[PDB]
Assembly symmetry: C2
Homo-oligomer: 282 residues x 2
């Protein structure tokens, strides 16, 4: 059982404190006592015995990890982090939506133990947490924070410099924007996800899904699309071509991006049928 | 109850025949009797009373709609479609993965009643079907095929020239390829979908999800990312800026891309918790 200092009693700070208090003690700090009171009344009653609410920083030196979730502004984050870094040598973790971790890190005195920890909303519900490292972050700090988050029951992905989730959301939104400008209804953009792509990417991911499509199929299909249209997004990737030269063409060969057993196709359909039934889309 | 002619007794043709035979009579044609025999033994026994297997085209003139699912090659598709167009004035529907519907249509004698119908795999399980229209396709042909598919229980999206699903898959795969080349493990690319983005896009779609993020939040966040990094995918869309000028900033304003009632945030969390529990990711 560790003690975690959480800076900022807004929605995200409050949620992080709830997620952590399941297993650890928390100190939740905010300069506003009104924010602390509002937070307290939103926290499950059983967890209140594990959370100290405060306006000051004296408990920072007693904590094993600091999580910062203040306003999304470079100078504000730098200011709070520079204050806390003098009080402790613990890992310092900014919940940063889009502010660059490298831009923050380069303004700290001791950036080797600073990194980004990107929680999803609500932090205590959603399983994914991304660790976003700067060029300064050391390996020990990553492994410590990764272990902490994993032991909390989170699914952890470590990213360099930028969030992978933000990257994928922007790539999808950029394409959706093209469709919107072309005249595609928003509802239809969403329906191709809600009734198809979201299901496949949920169960298999986009790369796992590719194995079932067939890596050979995908390379020649994307290549045709590139030669026909020829949007950059269709351009056939180099990593894919090494796979096809190896005969690692997917589920049909028992190996593509991943390795498969004989019942893979049958299991795919079983899992999709189950998800469709659950969602009421059967 | 209509009669539908399906050309090609491979996996996709066989699956389309199974999907349709739930409600309609089917003639399933292939030049190979061995393919027809293999198809017959994969078709549910209760449906066999609704499906005629044949090697010839005499029943095409009796059918209300023709679905073509032959080898993915322009000249092969054109050849079969040119043959069938002489025998009937019914809508002609090519299950085309990536071959351009416009390239096919321009080689037909009567392209006003030709369109693409893109079934997912397996056709009889997966609810989404895309209609992909050429510059020639008339509105009557679309509405007829859309109605047929809807009444079959499919979720139909009508697309101009290219599949929206193919577009989104290529956009996501292009970004994943960048990540792969950078050193991101495939498993991690997939985990950000399987444990997060796939769930959000399944339940809300990428645009509906944006409403909860906040359209104002997204515009300024993407704008920062564009000014900082500045990948084209971060470039802030024009449609978004009109929304923010209108105060249609999302769920918080009761209106963004879509319109919302007071319990929207609470209902979002309830639906995500239910899906997490079902998937065993809670
Ligand atoms: Cl203090
Ligand atoms: Cl004939």
């Amino acid at each position: 059982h560790m003690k975690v200092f959480v800076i900022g009693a807004g929605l995200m700070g409050r949620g992080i404190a709830i997620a952590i208090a399941s297993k650890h003690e928390v100190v939740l700090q905010d300069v506003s006592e009104k924010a602390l009171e509002a937070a307290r009344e939103q926290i499950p009653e059983e967890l209140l015995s594990k959370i100290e609410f405060t306006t000051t920083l004296e408990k920072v030196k007693d904590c094993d990890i600091v999580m910062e979730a203040v306003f999304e502004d470079l100078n504000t984050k730098v200011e709070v982090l520079r204050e806390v870094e003098r009080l402790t040598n613990a890992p310092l973790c900014s919940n940063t939506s889009v502010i660059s971790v490298d831009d923050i890190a380069e303004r700290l005195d001791s950036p080797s133990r600073f990194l980004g920890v990107h929680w999803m909303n609500p932090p205590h519900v959603m399983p994914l947490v991304e660790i976003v490292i700067s060029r300064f972050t050391d390996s020990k700090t990553v492994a410590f924070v990764e272990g902490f988050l994993r032991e909390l029951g989170k699914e952890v992905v470590v990213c360099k410099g930028q969030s992978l989730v933000n990257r994928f959301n922007a790539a999808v939104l950029s394409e959706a924007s093209r469709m919107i400008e072309e005249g595609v209804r928003a509802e239809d953009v969403d329906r191709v996800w809600k009734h198809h792509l979201g299901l496949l990417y949920t169960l298999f991911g986009p790369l796992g899904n590719l194995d079932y499509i067939g890596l050979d199929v995908a390379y020649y299909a994307s290549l045709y699309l590139y030669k026909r249209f020829g949007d950059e997004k269709f351009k056939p990737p180099e990593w894919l071509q090494e796979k096809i030269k190896k005969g690692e063409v997917g589920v049909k060969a028992g190996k593509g991006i991943y390795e498969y057993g004989p019942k893979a196709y049958e299991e795919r359909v079983e899992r999709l049928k189950k998800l469709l039934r659950f969602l009421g889309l059967e």
